[PDB]
Amino acid sequence: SDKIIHLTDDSFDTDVLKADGAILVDFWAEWCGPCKMIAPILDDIADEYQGKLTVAKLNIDQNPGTAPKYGIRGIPTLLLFKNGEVAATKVGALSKGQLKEFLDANLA
């Protein structure tokens, strides 16, 4: 919570679907080891990608509604949205190097 949008099921439309640009949503849970591995990396990305995209996190236990809409099974799942439409999907943990390459390739 500096640049990261802490999303809810009620805030999801406004925060993600109505945003004039790119949003990287992280579907995640507290018990999930790989999710917690990538949190510090998302902190990094949010800073590094100022003005290019916003990072948003949706905890799928506290907010149960949203994930079934996007077919999410494995977590973490990262969905790159561009103006409310999903452009790119990444399932499971990955490094900062790997995530940057994912974003750079798909933001274009």
Curated annotation (Swiss-Prot):
Active site: which residues? C32, C35
InterPro entries assigned to the protein according to its UniProt record, in alphabetical order: Thioredoxin, Thioredoxin-like_sf, Thioredoxin_CS, Thioredoxin_domain
Marked site, Contributes to redox potential value, at: G33, P34
Top-rank taxon, per record: Bacteria
Q: Which family does it belong to?
A: Belongs to the thioredoxin family.
Q: How does the annotation summarize its subunit structure?
A: Monomer. Interacts with bacteriophage T3 DNA polymerase.
Q: Which NCBIfam families match?
A: PRK09381.1, thioredoxin
Kindly provide the name given to this protein in its UniProt entry: Thioredoxin 1
